[PDB]
Amino acid sequence: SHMEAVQNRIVEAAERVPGVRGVIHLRARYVGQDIWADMIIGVDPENTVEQAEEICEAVQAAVCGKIRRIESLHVSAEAREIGDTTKPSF
Nearest to 46 by CA among 80, 14, 86: 80
- Contacts (Cβ under 8 Å, ≥6 apart) of 84: 21, 42
Q: Which stretch binds a second copy (CB under 8 A): 3-11, 28-36, 46-54, 61-69?
A: 46-54
- Residues 51-90 interacting with a second copy (rule: CB under 8 A): 52-53, 56, 74, 76-79
Dist CA 49 CA 2 (whole Å):
34
Nearer to a second copy, 18 or 33 (CB): 18
Nearest to 55 by CA among 30, 90, 80, 82: 80
For a second copy, the binding residue among 50, 68, 82, 85 (CB under 8 A) is 50
Q: Which stretch binds a second copy (CB under 8 A): 7-15, 29-37, 47-55, 64-72?
A: 47-55
SS3 call for 25: strand
Binding site for a second copy (CB under 8 A): 25, 40, 43-50, 52-53, 56, 74, 76-79
